[PDB]
Design a protein around this motif. Structure first.
Motif, PDB file in Angstrom:
ATOM      1  N   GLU A   4      80.406  64.919  57.664  1.00 43.40           N
ATOM      2  CA  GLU A   4      81.839  64.301  58.203  1.00 43.40           C
ATOM      3  C   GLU A   4      81.802  64.597  59.920  1.00 43.40           C
ATOM      4  N   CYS A   6      78.890  64.164  61.805  1.00 48.65           N
ATOM      5  CA  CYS A   6      78.362  62.858  62.830  1.00 48.65           C
ATOM      6  C   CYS A   6      78.871  61.485  62.421  1.00 48.65           C
ATOM      7  N   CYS A   7      78.939  61.216  61.125  1.00 47.27           N
ATOM      8  CA  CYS A   7      79.247  59.766  60.650  1.00 47.27           C
ATOM      9  C   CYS A   7      80.938  60.010  61.101  1.00 47.27           C
ATOM     10  N   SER A   9      82.433  61.392  63.259  1.00 45.54           N
ATOM     11  CA  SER A   9      82.581  62.048  64.519  1.00 45.54           C
ATOM     12  C   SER A   9      81.234  62.093  65.325  1.00 45.54           C
ATOM     13  N   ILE A  10      81.282  62.918  66.288  1.00 47.00           N
ATOM     14  CA  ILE A  10      79.986  63.354  67.150  1.00 47.00           C
ATOM     15  C   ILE A  10      79.358  64.662  66.789  1.00 47.00           C
ATOM     16  N   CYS A  11      78.331  64.943  66.282  1.00 49.87           N
ATOM     17  CA  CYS A  11      77.940  66.234  66.018  1.00 49.87           C
ATOM     18  C   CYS A  11      76.677  66.420  66.767  1.00 49.87           C
TER      19      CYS A  11
ATOM     20  N   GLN B   4      76.649  61.433  69.493  1.00 44.90           N
ATOM     21  CA  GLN B   4      77.306  60.203  68.824  1.00 44.90           C
ATOM     22  C   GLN B   4      77.569  60.368  67.433  1.00 44.90           C
ATOM     23  N   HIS B   5      77.934  59.677  66.698  1.00 39.52           N
ATOM     24  CA  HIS B   5      78.009  59.829  65.046  1.00 39.52           C
ATOM     25  C   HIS B   5      76.599  59.681  64.416  1.00 39.52           C
TER      26      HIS B   5
END
Lengths: 21, 30
Positions: A4, A6-7, A9-11, B4-5
């Motif tokens: 949750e 990276c997909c 949001s941005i990790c 980014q995602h």
């Protein structure tokens, strides 16, 4: 989490670092 | 490399590039 951050949001490489070893 | 995602397919490629030879274990589902 990693699913949750990276997909959904941005990790970063240090946030994803919590999955290495 | 870009903030980014990374949906699983991107994660598996961002988690390997970041920690591949080191191996890992990511399979959360909350």
């Amino acid at each position: 989490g990693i699913v949750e951050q990276c997909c959904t949001s941005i990790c970063s490489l240090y946030q994803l670092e919590n999955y290495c070893n | 490399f870009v903030n980014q995602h990374l949906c699983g397919s991107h994660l598996v490629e961002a988690l390997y590039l970041v920690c591949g030879e080191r191996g890992f274990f990511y399979t959360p589902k909350t």
